[PDB]
Amino acid sequence: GFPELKNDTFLRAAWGEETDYTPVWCMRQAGRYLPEFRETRAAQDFFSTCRSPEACCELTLQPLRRFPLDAAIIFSDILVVPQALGMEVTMVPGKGPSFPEPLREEQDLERLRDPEVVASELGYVFQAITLTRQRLAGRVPLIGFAGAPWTLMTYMVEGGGSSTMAQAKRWLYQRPQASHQLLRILTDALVPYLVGQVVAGAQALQLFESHAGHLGPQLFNKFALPYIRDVAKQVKARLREAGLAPVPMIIFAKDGHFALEELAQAGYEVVGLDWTVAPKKARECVGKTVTLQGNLDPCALYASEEEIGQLVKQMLDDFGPHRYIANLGHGLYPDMDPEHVGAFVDAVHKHSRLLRQ
Amino acid sequence: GFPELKNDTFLRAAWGEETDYTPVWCMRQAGRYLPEFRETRAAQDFFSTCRSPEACCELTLQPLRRFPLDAAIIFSDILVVPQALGMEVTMVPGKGPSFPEPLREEQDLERLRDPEVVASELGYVFQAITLTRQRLAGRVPLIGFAGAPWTLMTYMVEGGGSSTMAQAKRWLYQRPQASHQLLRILTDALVPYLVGQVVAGAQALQLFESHAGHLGPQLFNKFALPYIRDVAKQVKARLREAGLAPVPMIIFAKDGHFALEELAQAGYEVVGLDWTVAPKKARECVGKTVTLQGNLDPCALYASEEEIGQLVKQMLDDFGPHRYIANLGHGLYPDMDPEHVGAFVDAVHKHSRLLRQ
Numbered sequence: 028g029f030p031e032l033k034n035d036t037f038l039r040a041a042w043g044e045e046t047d048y049t050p051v052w053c054m055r056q057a058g059r060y061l062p063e064f065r066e067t068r069a070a071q072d073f074f075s076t077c078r079s080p081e082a083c084c085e086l087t088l089q090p091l092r093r094f095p096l097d098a099a100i101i102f103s104d105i106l107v108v109p110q111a112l113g114m115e116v117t118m119v120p121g122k123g124p125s126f127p128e129p130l131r132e133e134q135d136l137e138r139l140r141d142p143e144v145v146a147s148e149l150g151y152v153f154q155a156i157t158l159t160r161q162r163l164a165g166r167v168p169l170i171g172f173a174g175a176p177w178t179l180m181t182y183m184v185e186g187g188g189s190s191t192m193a194q195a196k197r198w199l200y201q202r203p204q205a206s207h208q209l210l211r212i213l214t215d216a217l218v219p220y221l222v223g224q225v226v227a228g229a230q231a232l233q234l235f236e237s238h239a240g241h242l243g244p245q246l247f248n249k250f251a252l253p254y255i256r257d258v259a260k261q262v263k264a265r266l267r268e269a270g271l272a273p274v275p276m277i278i279f280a281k282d283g284h285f286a287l288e289e290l291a292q293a294g295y296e297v298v299g300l301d302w303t304v305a306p307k308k309a310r311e312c313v314g315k316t317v318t319l320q321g322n323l324d325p326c327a328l329y330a331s332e333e334e335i336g337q338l339v340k341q342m343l344d345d346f347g348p349h350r351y352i353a354n355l356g357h358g359l360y361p362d363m364d365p366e367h368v369g370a371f372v373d374a375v376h377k378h379s380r381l382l383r384q
Numbered sequence: 385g386f387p388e389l390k391n392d393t394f395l396r397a398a399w400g401e402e403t404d405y406t407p408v409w410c411m412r413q414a415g416r417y418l419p420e421f422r423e424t425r426a427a428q429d430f431f432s433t434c435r436s437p438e439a440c441c442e443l444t445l446q447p448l449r450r451f452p453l454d455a456a457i458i459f460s461d462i463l464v465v466p467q468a469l470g471m472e473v474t475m476v477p478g479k480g481p482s483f484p485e486p487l488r489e490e491q492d493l494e495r496l497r498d499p500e501v502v503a504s505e506l507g508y509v510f511q512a513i514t515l516t517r518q519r520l521a522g523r524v525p526l527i528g529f530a531g532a533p534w535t536l537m538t539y540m541v542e543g544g545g546s547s548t549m550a551q552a553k554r555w556l557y558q559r560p561q562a563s564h565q566l567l568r569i570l571t572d573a574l575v576p577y578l579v580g581q582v583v584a585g586a587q588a589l590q591l592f593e594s595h596a597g598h599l600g601p602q603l604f605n606k607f608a609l610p611y612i613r614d615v616a617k618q619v620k621a622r623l624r625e626a627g628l629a630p631v632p633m634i635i636f637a638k639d640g641h642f643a644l645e646e647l648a649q650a651g652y653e654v655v656g657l658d659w660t661v662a663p664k665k666a667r668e669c670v671g672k673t674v675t676l677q678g679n680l681d682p683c684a685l686y687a688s689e690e691e692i693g694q695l696v697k698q699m700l701d702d703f704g705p706h707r708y709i710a711n712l713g714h715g716l717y718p719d720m721d722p723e724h725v726g727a728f729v730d731a732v733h734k735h736s737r738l739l740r741q
């Protein structure tokens with residue numbers, strides 16, 4: 028196996044244990060805001076980068092050379108799963124991901140792979156994880172991840188990003204049967220993939236329901252939540268059955284304010300929050316038995332270093348010291364200053380210690 | 385290729401030929417004792433400096449603008465090799481180099497790169513060498529370098545400097561198999577790196593066995609010397625096979641008094657000496673068929689310029705005019721006066737000429 032973990036603060040917090048300080052990581056900590064990321068990425072197309080264990084390992088490590096983050100997240104993408112299901116996907120400059128042949132009718136499901144063979148198609152991800160776990164040498168825990176079923180469905184049907192998800196929601200209302208079929212295919216692909224990430228060396232798992240906020244409560248409960256629940260249940264079961272230690276699982280439903288109570292009951296150790304939910308309100312919705320992660324407005328990092336410190340102070344005061352992992356409320360943007368990211372990390376560490384003594 | 389070499393005194397001496405005067409260079413001639421070095425270094429972290437061909441070229445050239453040294457040594461560091469093997473390394477203010485995750489058990493070797501890919505990771509070094517060779521414009525020869533296997537092993541296991549090397553020596557005594565494995569990985573990384581330095585423009589190579597003195601004869605013969613021999617043999621072989629002219633190779637084993645006889649038989653043109661060995665004794669140990677380099681106590685440069693001249697006279701008298709390159713017995717210290725370094729250089733040149741006519 029692997030080097031002994033030296034800083035386990037993130038894991039202890041995820042499981043709800045007291046720690047000496049609040050651990051912090053940043054969504055998209057490996058990203059274009061780092062000049063060195065841009066340089067490493069310049070050599071290959073995006074999905075080819077994802078296919079290279081050494082390139083993924085390098086990108087994962089880059090933020091940790093700059094900042095004393097309490098976790099690493101593997102460099103990959105949520106869209107590797109629809110790709111592995113047999114959909115062609117491109118990264119378009121300045122526009123983002125595109126599926127040139129999205130799913131538009133129920134007959135389109137015929138082209139997908141059997142979900143049970145998807146993990147075998149994602150071996151490159153597992154290779155990256157194993158390599159990164161070795162190279163991290165126990166410094167901090169490594170997080171694996173995937174997209175939640177609904178969020179992946181939206182990319183597969185919309186063919187990319189969308190402001191309304193009108194085509195994907197039209198499936199939910201006009202094609203409910205075919206939608207449940209597709210959501211089950213995705214769940215069945217995700218479970219062995221997530222399990223494989225842990226087998227390969229992942230020490231925690233985060234499921235990104237990035238497109239939660241388009242649904243609202245009734246649709247979310249019918250078409251998103253049952254699959255979010257199934258992923259966590261099945262992953263923990265398969266890990267037990269394999270003789271392995273289950274890992275803490277995080278559910279992040281961006282713009283999912285309306286689902287917080289349900290998500291705290293969905294079998295995830297940690298519930299991630301966007302910046303629109305006030306920390307004290309979130310604590311009320313989720314209760315005392317899950318850990319919260321988040322939730323600073325990423326745009327706050329445009330403020331001066333001093334201002335970032337005061338915003339971080341306020342955030343930490345509102346969350347309190349227990350059952351909390353600090354992060355942004357969404358990923359870092361490409362135009363952010365790495366020094367200001369550094370200021371965020373330093374302020375969490377400094378103030379969370381003051382809030383304990 | 386490159387400009388014709390104008391002053392080849394250093395090379396002629398290294399190969400054991402008569403020269404009109406004794407050539408001189410100073411270990412760490414690019415260093416903090418120069419105000420202009422401090423200024424150039426202020427802009428980046430140490431390893432980032434090493435990654436910049438222009439910064440390395442500038443640092444290499446700086447001492448040559450002050451002093452008529454008979455060789456330049458490329459600005460780099462021995463620890464680029466363990467870094468290129470996949471270990472993370474930092475420079476800590478006032479403390480020096482640190483590996484936050486040193487090798488402590490045999491399983492830790494799993495995280496290292498295959499040694500055959502290391503040279504590709506060190507392309508930046510070769511870029512610096514090529515640039516510096518061009519910019520030197522034939523003034524004097526350019527020396528490339530690396531750390532010897534044992535010395536690199538000590539940094540990788542200790543995680544930095546050490547007064548005893550107790551952890552690294554514990555490997556030798558308790559983990560001899562794993563030690564030989566690691567020493568072979570390092571040798572196999574070093575050879576293509578050294579060859580690449582010559583391909584890139586290096587005109588001589590120096591291998592630094594800085595931590596020799598901790599071993600004593602039995603351990604040195606089992607764990608240091610075989611790899612010192614292998615590096616020289618394999619480097620010269622690969623250069624021949626590539627159609628290239630082999631370069632003079634220097635072995636400097638600090639505090640290696642006990643190994644001098646063996647080092648003179650290890651396939652290096654030049655044996656470097658620390659200041660604790662009396663020049664006449666060294667000549668006795670090594671014989672008449674290698675060149676000696678050294679060996680003035682760097683602290684002697686704290687003495688007045690007149691005193692430096694007399695100490696240099698005595699040193700040159702003891703070494704004699706043949707098969708000798710003047711240098712210090714260790715690197716220049718940060719608090720030394722550049723004018724006194726100038727006095728050393730001038731005295732070697734002046735007195736070595738008097739000792740011939």
Ligand SMILES: Cc1c2[nH]c(c1CCC(=O)O)Cc1[nH]c(c(CCC(=O)O)c1C)Cc1[nH]c(c(CCC(=O)O)c1C)Cc1[nH]c(c(CCC(=O)O)c1C)C2
Nearest residue numbers: 055056057058100101102103104105123124188235237358
């Ligand atoms: C976890 C993760 C993701 N992407 C990347 C990582 C690796 C971790 C890290 O980079 O630190 C690399 C990762 N992936 C991508 C990038 C940008 C790369 C580049 O510009 O070179 C990076 C750093 C490409 C990408 N990939 C994706 C998009 C968004 C498309 C849209 O506008 O709707 C984009 C732009 C799909 C994607 N990918 C991801 C999400 C979840 C968003 C959330 O809820 O926080 C989504 C929706 C998650």
Ligand SMILES: Cc1c2[nH]c(c1CCC(=O)O)Cc1[nH]c(c(CCC(=O)O)c1C)Cc1[nH]c(c(CCC(=O)O)c1C)Cc1[nH]c(c(CCC(=O)O)c1C)C2
Nearest residue numbers: 412413414415457458459460461462480481545592594715
């Ligand atoms: C050949 C060389 C070295 N370092 C440097 C050079 C470039 C040549 C030149 O600077 O003139 C730059 C070079 N490298 C460094 C510096 C200091 C830079 C600074 O303070 O800004 C310089 C000038 C950083 C460094 N790098 C290292 C240390 C020592 C750690 C310890 O205490 O054990 C240090 C302090 C590792 C190192 N590096 C080196 C050795 C061999 C020592 C010997 O036997 O003579 C070693 C052991 C060799």
